[PDB]
Amino acid sequence: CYHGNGQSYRGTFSTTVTGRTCQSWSSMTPHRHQRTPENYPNDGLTMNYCRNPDADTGPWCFTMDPSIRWEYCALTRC
Ligand SMILES: NC[C@H]1CC[C@H](C(=O)NS(=O)(=O)c2ccccc2)CC1
């Protein structure tokens, strides 16, 4: 689980609500993005782990499915 809106989550879960695999935050493939550890160095944007850099309502990630840009992660609110 994550606390509040999930901004402080730093666990190692990396799978979405539909069972897709999170793209790595430093990767531009399949989805080109601007939410990189480059730009957000203090948000825990390590590997492909579920995170919340933009103050969303839960941890999320861009997905490895080329047709689905981003999803919330299959974690529950503590
Ligand atoms: N938690 C919700 C999602 C909303 C889409 C968002 C995105 O795609 N942002 S971005 O790569 O900086 C970006 C922003 C504007 C134009 C191109 C790319 C990722 C986070």
Side-chain angles (χ1 to χ4, degrees), residues 32-75:
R32 191 158 298 277
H33 69 92
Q34 283 161 59
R35 256 40 116 112
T36 59
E38 287 99 313
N39 312 325
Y40 295 73
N42 297 313
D43 278 291
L45 297 191
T46 301
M47 285 183 169
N48 62 328
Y49 300 155
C50 295
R51 291 296 179 269
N52 185 14
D54 59 339
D56 206 330
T57 47
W60 64 273
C61 62
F62 298 92
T63 95
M64 283 304 292
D65 182 327
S67 64
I68 303 293
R69 179 174 180 85
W70 75 275
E71 279 180 304
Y72 291 103
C73 285
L75 290 174

Side-chain angles (χ1 to χ4, degrees), residues 1-2 9 11 13-17 50-51 59-60 72-77:
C1 67
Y2 61 89
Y9 175 78
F13 202 87
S14 57
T15 314
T16 78
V17 69
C50 295
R51 291 296 179 269
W60 64 273
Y72 291 103
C73 285
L75 290 174
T76 191
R77 214 258 256 205

Side-chain angles (χ1 to χ4, degrees), residues 22-41:
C22 290
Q23 182 182 308
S24 302
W25 297 103
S26 66
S27 180
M28 289 298 107
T29 164
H31 306 109
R32 191 158 298 277
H33 69 92
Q34 283 161 59
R35 256 40 116 112
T36 59
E38 287 99 313
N39 312 325
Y40 295 73

